[model samples]
Target: ENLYFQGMKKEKVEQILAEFQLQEEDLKKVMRRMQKEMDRGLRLETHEEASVKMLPTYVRSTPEGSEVGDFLSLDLGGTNFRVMLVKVGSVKTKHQMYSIPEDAMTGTAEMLFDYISECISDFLDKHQMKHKKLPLGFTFSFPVRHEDIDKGILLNWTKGFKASGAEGNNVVGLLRDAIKRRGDFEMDVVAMVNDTVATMISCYYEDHQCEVGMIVGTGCNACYMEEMQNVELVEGDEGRMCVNTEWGAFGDSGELDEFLLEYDRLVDESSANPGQQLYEKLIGGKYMGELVRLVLLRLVDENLLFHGEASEQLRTRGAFETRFVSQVESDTGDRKQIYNILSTLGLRPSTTDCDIVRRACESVSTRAAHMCSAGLAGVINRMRESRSEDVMRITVGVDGSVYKLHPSFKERFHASVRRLTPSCEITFIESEEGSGRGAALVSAVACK
Candidate 1:
């Protein structure tokens, strides 16, 4: 009877995990679908209807090594804003980080910009650069419709920023006005870029072949240089321009309906933007832990874990942090570490429970890795076809906590990307201080 019960338990666990599995054929379908959506996003007439907004960042060229300049860079994406002095062609950089007060973040647009101007003034004073007018690059890591190299219209706010009078306005114009109001320094804002574009540019300084930048952090997004002819939204077909794929919104129009599991739906339904960022909810760090939590709760209800009982903490939303997912997966042997982690979550788990939990974590993360690889494969394949190359070589600049910290994610992601893009030789380069340094590089390239 005991042997029969053990066999049944194993079968049940396998059934649960199998739901998350994506066979090679499934990944290929995802890749092909992404390619189609990308084409739709690039077409001028169909662009508005496409879920993936292929916004043109008027950056026409990458940096040549000879481009030299001393530029200031401003980064305002999250709660912290940064001002930096970046000197290119010998490459020295210094930056000061200032935290945005709650009032400034949620207050009027003037208050937020005034605070940003104050930070810039302080940085210039410290560097004794107030007398000189330095060309600047503003890295505003929000969604903006770019009209020029130095102008972008803010689409909306995310990441807890609700500053009034900012949306539907030119962010660069706002910054320019703020600096003028401060009257402490005269400056020239040269270029504005998304963080993904900045990462690509920053990595380009190290590897000139790096043309794609991707973020796999709390959220997921990517940018790549596309042939001007393909970008119908822009005028000339002379050279390449960086297009921010804002790919996190890939599945909003039901592209991924088949792949999204119940856990993914639960997380999305409870998110700040439901029926939005569907692709990100499946693959991003922000929802990975929560997905695992919902799975564990299901297991408990099914009598597969913790003697069919769950701790109060386990039942709570967001209590199963993403870091715990990393920690649980980091378990080597003896199941000692898993025990400690489970205890912290107020569970008395058996050895079998620990094993099952580890497998569940792996299942969720593996699906995420595979899904991300398919999207990247779509991009790489497009690049190859754009140049009409039988065998293309390229480097992707990547940054983010999950890509860097997750134990097996890098290996799984790399292997899958290679398998999906057979005609390409791909090198993934991790970005170093990608946002700040990259913004400076964009400014330098523009000045050149």
Candidate 2:
């Protein structure tokens, strides 16, 4: 059987398969375009006067007690919902932590609010922090149409969510209203930020090295600082100071780079929001494994490689996770081989069958990482160009299991980054800490 898609031999295929490295400079053209698109995206599209101000993003009260103090962070992103108490207080080491569970991510709006409010109330109960004025940083991950720092109208839902009351309304007000209905306590809503924005604020408050904060978890998004002068509605807006450019709906425009295959087109068309977030559908955690699955199915169904393949698990949605694919891609031992993984995914295979799943997954992940790098490189390139600096040692805060767990993935991503820009410095601060902490940090700044 021919193992090569492009007529390469066994040893070559094995080597390429061993490490998902590509030797093409063409993979990087996307980043160049991404930089240009982001510059345009951040510029306000509307003619009406608007405020794209930066929310006095906290400088600290963090590890060294530089700025912010005691506050609560509400992290509503991915599968796990969390409420936490983080204190950057009088001492550098004064920070403390606590957390509670939630189901709003997959539950109804009322249920989500009830569940969240109850979770916070329970935390206060367990810690016995009573009769104290509390400020909250709500890290809500979703498309938000904003009116101000303390206000965000919920836009359409994504990530497989379509709950009622989540569209066309202020999400923070929904939260505030939920808490008020509880009538047990009062909390000041100083800031409502998406997880990506919180990641930026968190890293910036502590390190000041992070120029971009990205989440590669269940979804993908990158947030960075933007000047209000370039944003249209912000013209002559005196009160607004800074803007957080949330780059998630990026690459939604059908203009992918030249290398995309016909199958990539199919995946895009079959997506929930067809032709929207095409890059994210190819990359972000929630979809990485699925993207791999789709390609393998194409091969099996079409007799291109994995002939006569059939798997109910593969047919089902949400069965594949990024970690599962990463381990299979490691190919360390026979037991760890791709076939063994197929069995886990509910398929039996003969030695004669070409293992397209593994190859497909590697291709998807490696490509996803490459695309993710483009977003960073493009944005950083734009920023550096704007600042007119020779080079910027930019840091990026990352929150997602895919970026953290894969053995070869971090390296592959670095490879892609180098291909895009050889000298950009990037880092990942674990955002699993919850956006609420950053939100609280922001509130603490507002208090000052």
Candidate 3:
């Protein structure tokens, strides 16, 4: 009778895990839907309706190795902002990070920009370069409508930012005004690029074939070079331009509704931007742990884990962090690491419980990798068709904590990307100091 009871419990666990699995047909369908959205985003008439806003960066060309000058770069995306000084001739770079206080991040526009300008002043004083007026590249990693290379209108802030009087205004003009008010340092803010665009440009310095930039960290986003003729928002068909495909917003129009499970819906409903960034909620690191937590709770309710008893920590929201997922999946045969993690979460797990929890983490992370792969495949295939090439060789520049730290994510993501894009030979290059260096490189290229 005990053996029969064990068999029944195992079957129930399998049933829940199967919901996260994606078949080949489902991935193909997702890729096709993404391709359609990409086309719609590129058209001026259909752009407003498309979820993936393929905003043009106005970066007409990549680095030519002839860019020899000193430049300043500012990166303001997350809670921390960085200021960098890059010398292009010999390729030397230095940077400093300043943490943004809670008030500054949530205060008025003047408060935020004033704080940013003060940091620049302090950095310049530290380096003793306050006398030299330097060209600058501002890497603002947010959604924006670019009127030119140097001017971008802030659309809306994400990642816990709620600064007032910033949206719908020109960010470059605001920064310039802040510097002018201070009167201690003069800056020539020449260009603004998203973090994804900056990663691509920085990687291009080493590998010329890198045309795609992707981030899989706290959020997910990508940018790639496209034929100018295809970018309807921009005039002239002279050369190619980099387009920041805010693909995180890819499924905001309900295209991914069928794929979302009960756990995913619950996550989206509780997020800051509910009913938005659906695709990112499925693939980004920020939501991975929460998804796992929901699954574990379901298992506990079903008596499959923790002997039907869940600790208060496990019951709480966001208590099981994304890092714990990595730690649980990194377990070896002994299962000691898994036990330690569970204990921290206030659970006393049997050996079988450890096994089940690890499997659950695997299911959640595997789905994330596969979904990200399908999106990237759509991008690569579109590039190949646009160029009308029989076979295309390309390199994608990738950066993000999830991509780099997760043990199995890189291999799983790479395999799926290759399988989906059969006609392309792709290379994935991990970026180092991509945001700051790439911002400076954009300024250097503009000077050239």
Q: What is the TM-score of each candidate against the true structure?
A: 0.91, 0.81, 0.94
Instruction: List the candidate 2 regions with Cα displacement exceeding 4 Å.
Output: 1-25, 45-69, 90-108, 235-243, 257-271, 303-307, 335-339, 350-355, 422-434
Clashing pairs in 2: 50-233, 53-242, 54-242, 60-67, 60-68, 61-67, 61-68, 73-436, 74-436, 137-439
Winning model by TM-score: 3
**Across residues 5-45, which tens digit of lDDT does each residue of candidate 3 receive?**
76677678889999999987899899999989999999989
Model 1 per-residue lDDT tens digits across residues 273-305: 788888878888888899999999999989988
Q: How many Å off is the CA of 426 in candidate 3? A: 0.3
lDDT of 1 at 280: 77
**Native-referenced Cα lDDT, model 1:** 0.88
Shift of residue 197 alpha carbon in model 3, Å: 0.3
Give per-model CA RMSD. Answer: 2.7, 5.1, 2.1
What's the TM for model 2? 0.81
lDDT of each: 0.88, 0.62, 0.89
For model 2, how does the per-residue alpha-carbon lDDT over 149-239 read when each residue is reduced to its tens digit?
A: 6787875676666556778888888898888888886787777877777777676666777656777777777666544444444444222
In lDDT terms, how accurate is model 3?
0.89
TM-score for candidate 1: 0.91
- Residue pairs with colliding backbones in model 1 are none
Clashes (N, CA, C under 3 Å) per candidate: 0, 10, 0
